[PDB]
């Protein structure tokens, strides 16, 4: 109850006071990561049926 | 290096032989889920079937050489919507209710039966329903302080069904009180049942010896109805 | 975040009338079956009423038959419990509860001790 | 029609040999023929299609699926047996049309090929009857499910129907090989020689009729427990073809009509079994619908 | 007083929401509108692993992308060689209600747990060659829903008692306890660096925890119903959550809010499992409609469908090399797709 609500308030205060980057920067980072590893993604870009172990 | 390929072959052959033995054991056992509230006497039912921290309790018993595995849930939170899906392929769910709950947890039990019946993953599972506190129900209505009508106003205009078979030496007032409660659970069952699963109600007591046979008899009906469905004979 | 705000509770004379409103935010209101549950002083938490997504299906606990009316306005994302002829045993905290999953017939543990999709409740004293 | 002519001819030859040594309609026939040939053609096609479906879908593989596949194969063997019989009969008279070629017929009557083909025919008929018996026995053990087993009983079920007929088919021909060897094992001299192959068939017929009655009683009890006349009629009419109970009507010009009904309805039994247990089967229809959904999502 | 604490918590939530809205200058869809769609993803069932007798609840690939463990509701824990469909081990479990299984990164151990509230650790490299119960972790007061090895000696578990725990396997004691969820914690995912992990619960919320400190670093909302599945994006700066509201969502730890929602109107079933591909471009999700959906993570467009399971898809794993994806189902079959 009162102790639980106080703990919840403390957690909310601790979580609020953090540094957040802009959403655009996070979107750019996700896009850059996806672009940098596209060649190595076998399911995204299927490999020839010579190095596929499930042929 | 094909010798390792052969070794893998025989390891698989041995594993699959053991798996065939395990399948033979597994398909010959009937798994049952036992549900109920704190004041329902299902623990006494477990004790009677046995004598005749951990998150689940298991009970093994045999009736007519047929093996049954009844599972009781302990040490879990009251929110059951996630772990109830583990029992979507049991032979039956044994639902135990205190028929003398009022004076009322009976409406809470009615809703508990409602959620089990209409759950999307339990649609195919039949429910064996055990009206447990019959001995306490009999004395309560006779005492004149029962007044089932205040919690269920429809009991005032209720009449005992023709098919009802009272036990010898039973008051008529007890019979309609006993059978009204069963019909409350049966109207939920009849609605949305659609013939894919059924409810088997029983008037049990605390120390009835025949409770193993009742589960055995209802499991035969459930299994026979399943095979007949596979042949489109039902 | 899922949020349910209950309002309209207060002190009423026995036999009086009252109306409880549940404002729901943070989810698609029209997709969910809704419930009214009760917590009377000194006892457990009990389900009193429920209404389906459209309002076609309505059910009540036996003690409030012909006495309480549950209604639902999906346009304003709100639930109503019209209580008529209040009795002293109706004195309780009333919680607006939501079913755990959308467009589902069953509603497990909406009457549980620590159900997440339940409001803070409003006090009704008779 | 023609076999009477050849038996009269052989009796005439016997009389001539004794004198030398001892003494010092058709339209009804073709109508019946085309009827049961159409029945077997339809049964063959439907059972081939049903066997392909059951073997292919792979989600409906199970023990009763395997017993149904064996039953379908036995029906197909019966149909092939009758096709071989009524094609060989036509070919004998197409090739040996004149009187002077009938001697070759006698050779084919004395050849081992004729006896082998007739023994194969008898085995196919017995195997069909005993696979109907196996189907009934499996259903009965499903309903009275004490001592449930997994795959040891399947080997027994395959041994019966395929091997059990051999236990009384080849003892028959062999003994008829040692005593008669006449008329391509068709003509009957001693009744017991026909009995040793007739009684094992009647045993399966009686047993599957008893299983029929028991299963119908169980279904009636289930219908009592939970319009009922329609459901009972539907279940009975679905269970008759799978289990071959119509034979009980005649197992134990009126005879012409009875033969017409027997041949026609036995010929269409395979077709109706395939329809009722592969095509209008709800599980197979669900398989087809979901497979079509995946094919449309491809 | 409880009331003043109520308004204080509400005001804190309001200011957090205001800060999140201030940080939300644009949507990920707007930025990715100028990206090339992946087209249609076509995959075929290369392997069908059979041998389980009941529902499969859990699978987990090995770090070698070759072996994989599968947990089934018949008391079975089967190790498979995916290349040849060969079974390597078949461990019988004491309790047949197993909801989760893990495979140690070293490959020497497996873990399992479920309705017994116990996490069983099995040694696969015993000197005799058999598989024996090396350890049993007890102390959770609700069922085990997920478990992931940090290493051979540490394991983190998710329980239906609304808590997560970090266990030292050698001593069998709870090194750390993570609390703050109010519902059943249904899934946990380990960050690549293994210093943080995310957990989604039945309270329709996700929480990011620091493993060493034992405190809830961050909390994310947005879902309407229970979170059944959670997985990190490969770079460790984002994670996807699948829920019973029939949507998946993507959250960024730094942005501290929702980025993209993967849902379709024709989808009215909950998500049972989620997984990312090797580059994080494809987000695979299992459903109750018996299928799996391959979404374009950067665009929220369904790139493909995996179909072939006859019952509910409970399991979803992508290999560490990204070659294959394995799906378990309630039809008792494992499927390897490529």
PDB file of C-alpha atoms in Angstrom, chain B:
ATOM      1  CA  UNK B   1      34.730 -40.223 -41.591  1.00  0.00           C
ATOM      2  CA  UNK B   2      31.461 -42.048 -42.265  1.00  0.00           C
ATOM      3  CA  UNK B   3      32.056 -44.190 -39.162  1.00  0.00           C
ATOM      4  CA  UNK B   4      30.779 -41.283 -37.070  1.00  0.00           C
ATOM      5  CA  UNK B   5      27.763 -41.172 -39.388  1.00  0.00           C
ATOM      6  CA  UNK B   6      27.040 -44.817 -38.575  1.00  0.00           C
ATOM      7  CA  UNK B   7      27.566 -44.169 -34.857  1.00  0.00           C
ATOM      8  CA  UNK B   8      25.006 -41.362 -35.058  1.00  0.00           C
ATOM      9  CA  UNK B   9      22.699 -43.821 -36.845  1.00  0.00           C
ATOM     10  CA  UNK B  10      22.791 -46.385 -34.028  1.00  0.00           C
ATOM     11  CA  UNK B  11      22.540 -43.716 -31.329  1.00  0.00           C
ATOM     12  CA  UNK B  12      19.348 -42.544 -33.033  1.00  0.00           C
ATOM     13  CA  UNK B  13      18.073 -46.106 -33.369  1.00  0.00           C
ATOM     14  CA  UNK B  14      18.489 -46.720 -29.633  1.00  0.00           C
ATOM     15  CA  UNK B  15      16.936 -43.350 -28.782  1.00  0.00           C
ATOM     16  CA  UNK B  16      13.938 -44.089 -31.010  1.00  0.00           C
ATOM     17  CA  UNK B  17      13.484 -47.558 -29.504  1.00  0.00           C
ATOM     18  CA  UNK B  18      13.346 -45.940 -26.073  1.00  0.00           C
ATOM     19  CA  UNK B  19      10.967 -43.313 -27.478  1.00  0.00           C
ATOM     20  CA  UNK B  20       8.674 -46.052 -28.810  1.00  0.00           C
ATOM     21  CA  UNK B  21       8.571 -47.647 -25.360  1.00  0.00           C
ATOM     22  CA  UNK B  22       7.846 -44.235 -23.827  1.00  0.00           C
ATOM     23  CA  UNK B  23       5.074 -43.632 -26.372  1.00  0.00           C
ATOM     24  CA  UNK B  24       3.476 -46.963 -25.481  1.00  0.00           C
ATOM     25  CA  UNK B  25       3.550 -45.959 -21.812  1.00  0.00           C
ATOM     26  CA  UNK B  26       2.323 -42.413 -22.517  1.00  0.00           C
ATOM     27  CA  UNK B  27      -0.674 -43.253 -24.703  1.00  0.00           C
ATOM     28  CA  UNK B  28      -2.044 -45.782 -22.181  1.00  0.00           C
ATOM     29  CA  UNK B  29      -2.418 -43.223 -19.363  1.00  0.00           C
ATOM     30  CA  UNK B  30      -5.246 -40.733 -18.843  1.00  0.00           C
ATOM     31  CA  UNK B  31      -4.201 -37.295 -17.601  1.00  0.00           C
ATOM     32  CA  UNK B  32      -6.712 -35.379 -15.481  1.00  0.00           C
ATOM     33  CA  UNK B  33      -6.725 -31.796 -14.211  1.00  0.00           C
ATOM     34  CA  UNK B  34      -8.278 -31.281 -10.774  1.00  0.00           C
ATOM     35  CA  UNK B  35      -9.676 -27.801 -10.145  1.00  0.00           C
ATOM     36  CA  UNK B  36     -11.529 -26.217  -7.262  1.00  0.00           C
ATOM     37  CA  UNK B  37     -11.526 -23.582  -4.560  1.00  0.00           C
ATOM     38  CA  UNK B  38     -10.151 -23.667  -1.030  1.00  0.00           C
ATOM     39  CA  UNK B  39     -13.476 -24.624   0.561  1.00  0.00           C
ATOM     40  CA  UNK B  40     -14.368 -27.426  -1.839  1.00  0.00           C
ATOM     41  CA  UNK B  41     -12.864 -30.620  -0.391  1.00  0.00           C
ATOM     42  CA  UNK B  42     -10.850 -31.629  -3.453  1.00  0.00           C
ATOM     43  CA  UNK B  43      -7.859 -32.361  -1.214  1.00  0.00           C
ATOM     44  CA  UNK B  44     -10.010 -34.868   0.671  1.00  0.00           C
ATOM     45  CA  UNK B  45     -10.901 -36.372  -2.719  1.00  0.00           C
ATOM     46  CA  UNK B  46      -7.182 -36.735  -3.472  1.00  0.00           C
ATOM     47  CA  UNK B  47      -6.618 -38.367  -0.080  1.00  0.00           C
ATOM     48  CA  UNK B  48      -9.508 -40.787  -0.623  1.00  0.00           C
ATOM     49  CA  UNK B  49      -8.256 -41.798  -4.068  1.00  0.00           C
ATOM     50  CA  UNK B  50      -4.686 -42.229  -2.795  1.00  0.00           C
ATOM     51  CA  UNK B  51      -5.549 -44.329   0.260  1.00  0.00           C
ATOM     52  CA  UNK B  52      -7.914 -46.540  -1.761  1.00  0.00           C
ATOM     53  CA  UNK B  53       7.105 -24.860  -2.664  1.00  0.00           C
ATOM     54  CA  UNK B  54       6.364 -27.310  -5.475  1.00  0.00           C
ATOM     55  CA  UNK B  55       4.083 -25.909  -8.157  1.00  0.00           C
ATOM     56  CA  UNK B  56       2.053 -28.997  -9.047  1.00  0.00           C
ATOM     57  CA  UNK B  57       0.915 -32.138  -7.232  1.00  0.00           C
ATOM     58  CA  UNK B  58       0.460 -35.469  -8.997  1.00  0.00           C
ATOM     59  CA  UNK B  59      -1.717 -38.466  -8.125  1.00  0.00           C
ATOM     60  CA  UNK B  60      -1.525 -41.947  -9.654  1.00  0.00           C
ATOM     61  CA  UNK B  61      -4.365 -44.438  -9.340  1.00  0.00           C
ATOM     62  CA  UNK B  62      -5.668 -47.462 -11.233  1.00  0.00           C
ATOM     63  CA  UNK B  63      -9.284 -48.408 -11.920  1.00  0.00           C
ATOM     64  CA  UNK B  64      -9.830 -51.682 -13.809  1.00  0.00           C
ATOM     65  CA  UNK B  65      -6.107 -51.768 -14.710  1.00  0.00           C
ATOM     66  CA  UNK B  66      -6.461 -48.409 -16.513  1.00  0.00           C
ATOM     67  CA  UNK B  67      -3.918 -45.842 -15.340  1.00  0.00           C
ATOM     68  CA  UNK B  68      -4.934 -42.299 -14.400  1.00  0.00           C
ATOM     69  CA  UNK B  69      -2.683 -39.326 -13.631  1.00  0.00           C
ATOM     70  CA  UNK B  70      -4.530 -36.571 -11.759  1.00  0.00           C
ATOM     71  CA  UNK B  71      -2.728 -33.239 -11.432  1.00  0.00           C
ATOM     72  CA  UNK B  72      -3.501 -30.686  -8.730  1.00  0.00           C
ATOM     73  CA  UNK B  73      -2.124 -27.157  -8.919  1.00  0.00           C
ATOM     74  CA  UNK B  74      -0.419 -25.837  -5.808  1.00  0.00           C
ATOM     75  CA  UNK B  75       1.873 -22.915  -5.016  1.00  0.00           C
ATOM     76  CA  UNK B  76       0.668 -20.745  -7.892  1.00  0.00           C
ATOM     77  CA  UNK B  77      -0.840 -17.279  -7.960  1.00  0.00           C
ATOM     78  CA  UNK B  78      -4.592 -16.960  -8.429  1.00  0.00           C
ATOM     79  CA  UNK B  79      -4.127 -15.710 -12.015  1.00  0.00           C
ATOM     80  CA  UNK B  80      -4.580 -18.928 -13.995  1.00  0.00           C
ATOM     81  CA  UNK B  81      -5.050 -17.730 -17.585  1.00  0.00           C
ATOM     82  CA  UNK B  82      -1.467 -18.587 -18.603  1.00  0.00           C
ATOM     83  CA  UNK B  83      -0.763 -21.964 -16.996  1.00  0.00           C
ATOM     84  CA  UNK B  84      -4.238 -23.328 -17.771  1.00  0.00           C
ATOM     85  CA  UNK B  85      -3.141 -23.746 -21.408  1.00  0.00           C
ATOM     86  CA  UNK B  86      -0.804 -26.572 -20.365  1.00  0.00           C
ATOM     87  CA  UNK B  87      -3.903 -28.756 -19.880  1.00  0.00           C
ATOM     88  CA  UNK B  88      -5.494 -28.329 -23.307  1.00  0.00           C
ATOM     89  CA  UNK B  89      -5.040 -32.035 -24.134  1.00  0.00           C
ATOM     90  CA  UNK B  90      -6.098 -33.751 -20.903  1.00  0.00           C
ATOM     91  CA  UNK B  91      -8.757 -36.447 -21.002  1.00  0.00           C
ATOM     92  CA  UNK B  92     -10.987 -34.428 -18.672  1.00  0.00           C
ATOM     93  CA  UNK B  93     -11.015 -31.625 -16.128  1.00  0.00           C
ATOM     94  CA  UNK B  94     -12.432 -32.557 -12.731  1.00  0.00           C
ATOM     95  CA  UNK B  95     -14.230 -29.501 -11.337  1.00  0.00           C
ATOM     96  CA  UNK B  96     -15.095 -29.662  -7.630  1.00  0.00           C
ATOM     97  CA  UNK B  97     -17.565 -27.273  -6.004  1.00  0.00           C
ATOM     98  CA  UNK B  98     -18.989 -26.944  -2.505  1.00  0.00           C
ATOM     99  CA  UNK B  99     -22.725 -27.272  -3.123  1.00  0.00           C
ATOM    100  CA  UNK B 100     -23.425 -25.734   0.318  1.00  0.00           C
ATOM    101  CA  UNK B 101     -21.293 -22.660  -0.412  1.00  0.00           C
ATOM    102  CA  UNK B 102     -24.040 -20.116   0.288  1.00  0.00           C
ATOM    103  CA  UNK B 103     -24.694 -18.791   3.803  1.00  0.00           C
ATOM    104  CA  UNK B 104     -22.021 -17.408  -1.196  1.00  0.00           C
ATOM    105  CA  UNK B 105     -19.051 -18.664  -3.152  1.00  0.00           C
ATOM    106  CA  UNK B 106     -21.378 -20.586  -5.482  1.00  0.00           C
ATOM    107  CA  UNK B 107     -21.619 -17.710  -7.960  1.00  0.00           C
ATOM    108  CA  UNK B 108     -17.819 -17.461  -7.985  1.00  0.00           C
ATOM    109  CA  UNK B 109     -17.720 -21.184  -8.769  1.00  0.00           C
ATOM    110  CA  UNK B 110     -20.334 -20.697 -11.497  1.00  0.00           C
ATOM    111  CA  UNK B 111     -18.103 -18.114 -13.183  1.00  0.00           C
ATOM    112  CA  UNK B 112     -15.082 -20.378 -12.737  1.00  0.00           C
ATOM    113  CA  UNK B 113     -16.959 -23.057 -14.679  1.00  0.00           C
ATOM    114  CA  UNK B 114     -17.936 -20.388 -17.221  1.00  0.00           C
ATOM    115  CA  UNK B 115     -14.312 -19.453 -17.962  1.00  0.00           C
ATOM    116  CA  UNK B 116     -13.187 -23.081 -18.280  1.00  0.00           C
ATOM    117  CA  UNK B 117     -16.088 -23.974 -20.582  1.00  0.00           C
ATOM    118  CA  UNK B 118     -15.578 -21.045 -22.963  1.00  0.00           C
ATOM    119  CA  UNK B 119     -11.772 -20.898 -22.992  1.00  0.00           C
ATOM    120  CA  UNK B 120     -10.475 -21.170 -26.544  1.00  0.00           C
ATOM    121  CA  UNK B 121      -7.842 -23.785 -25.657  1.00  0.00           C
ATOM    122  CA  UNK B 122     -10.217 -25.864 -23.491  1.00  0.00           C
ATOM    123  CA  UNK B 123     -13.091 -26.045 -25.998  1.00  0.00           C
ATOM    124  CA  UNK B 124     -12.512 -29.747 -26.696  1.00  0.00           C
ATOM    125  CA  UNK B 125     -12.064 -30.879 -23.079  1.00  0.00           C
ATOM    126  CA  UNK B 126     -14.938 -32.469 -21.181  1.00  0.00           C
ATOM    127  CA  UNK B 127     -15.532 -31.529 -17.549  1.00  0.00           C
ATOM    128  CA  UNK B 128     -16.383 -33.981 -14.787  1.00  0.00           C
ATOM    129  CA  UNK B 129     -18.308 -31.896 -12.257  1.00  0.00           C
ATOM    130  CA  UNK B 130     -18.355 -32.970  -8.606  1.00  0.00           C
ATOM    131  CA  UNK B 131     -20.959 -31.395  -6.316  1.00  0.00           C
ATOM    132  CA  UNK B 132     -18.976 -32.130  -3.161  1.00  0.00           C
ATOM    133  CA  UNK B 133     -20.562 -30.990   0.088  1.00  0.00           C
ATOM    134  CA  UNK B 134     -23.823 -32.901  -0.293  1.00  0.00           C
ATOM    135  CA  UNK B 135     -23.940 -33.958   3.367  1.00  0.00           C
ATOM    136  CA  UNK B 136     -23.560 -30.341   4.501  1.00  0.00           C
ATOM    137  CA  UNK B 137     -26.085 -29.157   1.904  1.00  0.00           C
ATOM    138  CA  UNK B 138     -28.703 -31.571   3.256  1.00  0.00           C
ATOM    139  CA  UNK B 139     -28.495 -30.271   6.826  1.00  0.00           C
ATOM    140  CA  UNK B 140     -28.390 -26.605   5.778  1.00  0.00           C
ATOM    141  CA  UNK B 141     -31.664 -26.600   3.830  1.00  0.00           C
ATOM    142  CA  UNK B 142     -33.411 -28.629   6.540  1.00  0.00           C
ATOM    143  CA  UNK B 143     -32.323 -26.108   9.187  1.00  0.00           C
ATOM    144  CA  UNK B 144     -34.547 -23.497   7.528  1.00  0.00           C
ATOM    145  CA  UNK B 145     -31.824 -20.824   7.442  1.00  0.00           C
ATOM    146  CA  UNK B 146     -30.630 -21.621   3.909  1.00  0.00           C
ATOM    147  CA  UNK B 147     -32.707 -19.204   1.791  1.00  0.00           C
ATOM    148  CA  UNK B 148     -31.130 -19.963  -1.573  1.00  0.00           C
ATOM    149  CA  UNK B 149     -33.528 -17.430  -3.126  1.00  0.00           C
ATOM    150  CA  UNK B 150     -31.622 -14.354  -1.916  1.00  0.00           C
ATOM    151  CA  UNK B 151     -28.504 -15.268  -3.899  1.00  0.00           C
ATOM    152  CA  UNK B 152     -30.422 -16.942  -6.754  1.00  0.00           C
ATOM    153  CA  UNK B 153     -33.871 -15.351  -7.162  1.00  0.00           C
ATOM    154  CA  UNK B 154     -34.765 -17.905  -9.856  1.00  0.00           C
ATOM    155  CA  UNK B 155     -34.941 -20.648  -7.206  1.00  0.00           C
ATOM    156  CA  UNK B 156     -38.356 -19.372  -6.078  1.00  0.00           C
ATOM    157  CA  UNK B 157     -40.022 -20.440  -9.345  1.00  0.00           C
ATOM    158  CA  UNK B 158     -37.886 -23.567  -9.868  1.00  0.00           C
ATOM    159  CA  UNK B 159     -39.442 -27.038  -9.838  1.00  0.00           C
ATOM    160  CA  UNK B 160     -37.721 -30.402  -9.529  1.00  0.00           C
ATOM    161  CA  UNK B 161     -37.192 -32.009 -12.960  1.00  0.00           C
ATOM    162  CA  UNK B 162     -38.995 -35.222 -13.827  1.00  0.00           C
ATOM    163  CA  UNK B 163     -35.764 -37.111 -14.575  1.00  0.00           C
ATOM    164  CA  UNK B 164     -34.449 -36.304 -11.083  1.00  0.00           C
ATOM    165  CA  UNK B 165     -33.787 -39.459  -9.052  1.00  0.00           C
ATOM    166  CA  UNK B 166     -33.705 -38.710  -5.308  1.00  0.00           C
ATOM    167  CA  UNK B 167     -31.783 -40.978  -2.990  1.00  0.00           C
ATOM    168  CA  UNK B 168     -33.959 -43.099  -0.672  1.00  0.00           C
ATOM    169  CA  UNK B 169     -34.921 -41.339   2.538  1.00  0.00           C
ATOM    170  CA  UNK B 170     -34.386 -37.812   1.189  1.00  0.00           C
ATOM    171  CA  UNK B 171     -36.527 -34.753   1.832  1.00  0.00           C
ATOM    172  CA  UNK B 172     -38.142 -33.212  -1.277  1.00  0.00           C
ATOM    173  CA  UNK B 173     -36.827 -29.789  -0.234  1.00  0.00           C
ATOM    174  CA  UNK B 174     -33.268 -31.129  -0.362  1.00  0.00           C
ATOM    175  CA  UNK B 175     -33.864 -32.664  -3.798  1.00  0.00           C
ATOM    176  CA  UNK B 176     -34.852 -29.415  -5.514  1.00  0.00           C
ATOM    177  CA  UNK B 177     -32.101 -27.475  -3.739  1.00  0.00           C
ATOM    178  CA  UNK B 178     -29.616 -30.166  -4.768  1.00  0.00           C
ATOM    179  CA  UNK B 179     -30.880 -30.261  -8.362  1.00  0.00           C
ATOM    180  CA  UNK B 180     -31.260 -26.493  -8.785  1.00  0.00           C
ATOM    181  CA  UNK B 181     -27.511 -26.061  -8.263  1.00  0.00           C
ATOM    182  CA  UNK B 182     -26.767 -28.747 -10.853  1.00  0.00           C
ATOM    183  CA  UNK B 183     -29.011 -27.008 -13.393  1.00  0.00           C
ATOM    184  CA  UNK B 184     -27.143 -23.738 -12.822  1.00  0.00           C
ATOM    185  CA  UNK B 185     -23.968 -25.483 -13.954  1.00  0.00           C
ATOM    186  CA  UNK B 186     -25.787 -27.350 -16.729  1.00  0.00           C
ATOM    187  CA  UNK B 187     -27.226 -24.243 -18.404  1.00  0.00           C
ATOM    188  CA  UNK B 188     -23.680 -22.922 -18.837  1.00  0.00           C
ATOM    189  CA  UNK B 189     -22.647 -26.307 -20.246  1.00  0.00           C
ATOM    190  CA  UNK B 190     -25.617 -26.611 -22.612  1.00  0.00           C
ATOM    191  CA  UNK B 191     -24.958 -23.149 -24.034  1.00  0.00           C
ATOM    192  CA  UNK B 192     -21.992 -23.159 -26.457  1.00  0.00           C
ATOM    193  CA  UNK B 193     -21.300 -26.861 -25.878  1.00  0.00           C
ATOM    194  CA  UNK B 194     -21.961 -27.600 -29.576  1.00  0.00           C
ATOM    195  CA  UNK B 195     -21.408 -31.327 -29.008  1.00  0.00           C
ATOM    196  CA  UNK B 196     -17.601 -31.152 -29.064  1.00  0.00           C
ATOM    197  CA  UNK B 197     -17.319 -31.607 -25.281  1.00  0.00           C
ATOM    198  CA  UNK B 198     -19.678 -32.403 -22.432  1.00  0.00           C
ATOM    199  CA  UNK B 199     -20.164 -32.023 -18.690  1.00  0.00           C
ATOM    200  CA  UNK B 200     -20.720 -34.965 -16.346  1.00  0.00           C
ATOM    201  CA  UNK B 201     -22.245 -33.846 -13.014  1.00  0.00           C
ATOM    202  CA  UNK B 202     -22.068 -36.024  -9.914  1.00  0.00           C
ATOM    203  CA  UNK B 203     -23.429 -35.578  -6.392  1.00  0.00           C
ATOM    204  CA  UNK B 204     -20.382 -36.573  -4.349  1.00  0.00           C
ATOM    205  CA  UNK B 205     -19.504 -36.456  -0.655  1.00  0.00           C
ATOM    206  CA  UNK B 206     -16.353 -36.001   1.400  1.00  0.00           C
ATOM    207  CA  UNK B 207     -15.486 -39.691   1.728  1.00  0.00           C
ATOM    208  CA  UNK B 208     -17.310 -41.417  -1.126  1.00  0.00           C
ATOM    209  CA  UNK B 209     -15.434 -44.563  -2.131  1.00  0.00           C
ATOM    210  CA  UNK B 210     -16.951 -44.667  -5.637  1.00  0.00           C
ATOM    211  CA  UNK B 211     -15.293 -41.427  -6.787  1.00  0.00           C
ATOM    212  CA  UNK B 212     -12.584 -43.386  -8.627  1.00  0.00           C
ATOM    213  CA  UNK B 213     -15.197 -45.378 -10.550  1.00  0.00           C
ATOM    214  CA  UNK B 214     -17.116 -42.227 -11.499  1.00  0.00           C
ATOM    215  CA  UNK B 215     -14.002 -40.716 -13.085  1.00  0.00           C
ATOM    216  CA  UNK B 216     -13.307 -44.051 -14.791  1.00  0.00           C
ATOM    217  CA  UNK B 217     -16.877 -44.346 -16.098  1.00  0.00           C
ATOM    218  CA  UNK B 218     -16.931 -40.793 -17.466  1.00  0.00           C
ATOM    219  CA  UNK B 219     -13.521 -41.257 -19.088  1.00  0.00           C
ATOM    220  CA  UNK B 220     -14.845 -44.296 -20.970  1.00  0.00           C
ATOM    221  CA  UNK B 221     -17.728 -42.200 -22.302  1.00  0.00           C
ATOM    222  CA  UNK B 222     -15.350 -39.385 -23.292  1.00  0.00           C
ATOM    223  CA  UNK B 223     -12.962 -41.733 -25.099  1.00  0.00           C
ATOM    224  CA  UNK B 224     -15.743 -43.687 -26.812  1.00  0.00           C
ATOM    225  CA  UNK B 225     -17.371 -40.458 -28.006  1.00  0.00           C
ATOM    226  CA  UNK B 226     -14.002 -39.404 -29.426  1.00  0.00           C
ATOM    227  CA  UNK B 227     -13.507 -42.603 -31.437  1.00  0.00           C
ATOM    228  CA  UNK B 228     -17.105 -42.528 -32.680  1.00  0.00           C
ATOM    229  CA  UNK B 229     -16.561 -38.945 -33.848  1.00  0.00           C
ATOM    230  CA  UNK B 230     -13.476 -40.034 -35.805  1.00  0.00           C
ATOM    231  CA  UNK B 231     -15.696 -42.524 -37.665  1.00  0.00           C
ATOM    232  CA  UNK B 232     -18.585 -40.038 -38.070  1.00  0.00           C
ATOM    233  CA  UNK B 233     -20.820 -42.391 -36.114  1.00  0.00           C
ATOM    234  CA  UNK B 234     -21.718 -39.450 -33.857  1.00  0.00           C
TER     235      UNK B 234
END
